[PDB]
Design a protein around this ligand. Structure first.
Ligand SMILES: *C/C=C(C)/C=C/C=C(C)/C=C/C1=C(C)CCCC1(C)C
Ligand SMILES: *C/C=C(C)/C=C/C=C(C)/C=C/C1=C(C)CCCC1(C)C
Ligand SMILES: *C/C=C(C)/C=C/C=C(C)/C=C/C1=C(C)CCCC1(C)C
Lengths: 228, 228, 228
């Protein structure tokens, strides 16, 4: 339940808060329109994560879900976080490669399904069913990764070489980090429970900070965010 | 409760899933920007419906609401579905006639009110009050239908004849199908309960598949989605 | 609990409904694209508020929250209202000064955090924690007010003098009214409880009608909404 993992929740809260402040201050020295958008998007991501990590730390974002004949602690606040932060991260990537509206909607929509079905799975009372939702959510994730490689990368090359290289790195970072989430879910408290909640929380914290703060540091330090 | 109607929920799940896959594959042979948008929007609709129909089939999207001195089974997942799919359908229509941002916001906003108030009515514990919400939701629906005829049709004519004819058909399809929803709600388990949940579920399934898959088939088979 | 304050909820419901109808009818005599947007945005605000005020009046938007060792009545419907109406009001201001996408996203995002954290605070079971959320929400509000003065006003001056003057008035109206909300929350039933729910409801009603209907009357009566 909500106790051993408190340290990872506290560290997550602190790291997201610090990241938000760093991006906020760093963005003060920016007036370029396009550069503005990237800062706005990128700073909102850890700001949201900060509030949800704090909600979990304080116990608000935690609930008990019956399944497997047991009362299992489930941090639902994560999904509220991801619901808004994952599409924002996708928007950063899309804006970078100047994706068309159609592809953006496809990505945001698939992302919404990924998080929504993940939440349904996390709160499902029938054990076996939890994995059905996991599969559907994973399929949505694969769709997103597909678009990022066969509907994005190809266009990034048709853009400025500075944009292409920054997109390629952020793209690779996204694919590696995002793909780890379903694995942690599958092995953790929400899934088969091979890994305890304490360790599951630690894993998500490392992933979240990297996917948000790490991702943001790479993007906001790049010249790709400016139109030159 | 959740049993007799299982067959309609299973059929709905299957039909939405098949529709989503068909649109997904069909869209692979498309590269045109504007055509892209229509495929993205139209494929997301049954994809979302698929997840919610499955949630109902598995029992997750079902809840018990006390009213009329009874414990009434209410499938709340429908509203989660409609909250996102109805405005997407409206966006398809709006994009088709190249509606201005102002009208799109008006439609999306009215739609949000329609579904939101429908949900409030569906979960209201005071019988007589349920119909007050039904009336407000219906008023919002009438607003939407009004705009589609006196704020859309008139412009579709000012566009390409291919767009005008496809819009006219989809418009007519929308008006006929959407108008049936409040009637089913009024006579079904959420309303006066003249029709049993089993039959109510069947009716919504026929309406949903037609309004989503049927609607999509007409749109995506049209040349109106391309700019020529 | 839900009784003495019924009159303020009924008055709020009536005033929001009347405002919505007035804006609806007034907007009929408009065809200008940009003018359209302002009417669509501005009419949706009181329309949404109307539904939520009615939900509170009927008892649906009310819930009991345990804290301070007591069962405290909390009208959660307010946050559902504000979640959608505050960013819409910000959009009116942003459209007026032709703000760039980056700033709009920053405002909408900060607003989402403001309302979200306010809701978390309103439903928190640990008394002292409620004020932590209040502080975070207030910080988000201050960010919004900052942008409206150092990221908006400066640009409004670079626009038509009619737009600048209307923005300045609406800006001032927004800053004064919005700043009162955290104070009412802090002194009312959601906070330290120095003011009874009855009076708290009255205060929010006066603020809401002014910030929505009053704000709208000023905007929609202005020539600033037209491009000339
Ligand atoms: C800041 C957070 C980030 C970048 C979060 C990313 C989350 C995902 C890619 C989550 C994916 C999931 C699945 C593919 C299946 C099971 C449910 C989820 C939600 C863990
Ligand atoms: C895929 C789903 C579609 C096109 C659904 C459409 C739903 C409506 C037009 C629903 C309308 C309702 C009312 C007018 C009043 C009562 C509540 C609703 C939600 C059944
Ligand atoms: C129609 C409603 C309007 C313009 C509402 C405005 C609401 C705010 C500025 C609310 C702010 C809050 C805080 C700064 C802290 C405590 C929580 C709130 C939600 C009362």
């Amino acid at each position: 339940t909500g106790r051993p993992e408190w340290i990872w929740l506290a560290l997550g809260t602190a790291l997201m808060g610090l990241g938000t402040l760093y991006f906020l201050v760093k963005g003060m020295g920016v007036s370029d329109p396009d550069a503005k958008k990237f800062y706005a998007i990128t700073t909102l991501v850890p700001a949201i994560a900060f509030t949800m990590y704090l909600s979990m730390l304080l116990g608000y974002g935690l609930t008990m879900v019956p399944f497997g004949g047991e009362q299992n602690p489930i941090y639902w606040a994560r999904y509220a976080d991801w619901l808004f932060t994952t599409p924002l991260l996708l928007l950063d990537l899309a804006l970078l490669v100047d994706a068309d509206q159609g592809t953006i909607l496809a990505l945001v929509g698939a992302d919404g399904i990924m998080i929504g079905t993940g939440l349904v799975g996390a709160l499902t009372k029938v054990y076996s069913y939890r994995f059905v939702w996991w599969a559907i959510s994973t399929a949505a994730m694969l769709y997103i990764l597909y678009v990022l490689f066969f509907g994005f990368t190809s266009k990034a090359e048709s853009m400025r070489p500075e944009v292409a290289s920054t997109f390629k790195v952020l793209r690779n970072v996204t694919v590696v980090l995002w793909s780890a989430y379903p694995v942690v879910w599958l092995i953790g408290s929400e899934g088969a429970g091979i890994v305890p909640l304490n360790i599951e929380t630690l894993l998500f914290m490392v992933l979240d900070v990297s996917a948000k703060v790490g991702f943001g540091l790479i993007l906001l330090r790049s010249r790709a965010i400016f139109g030159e």
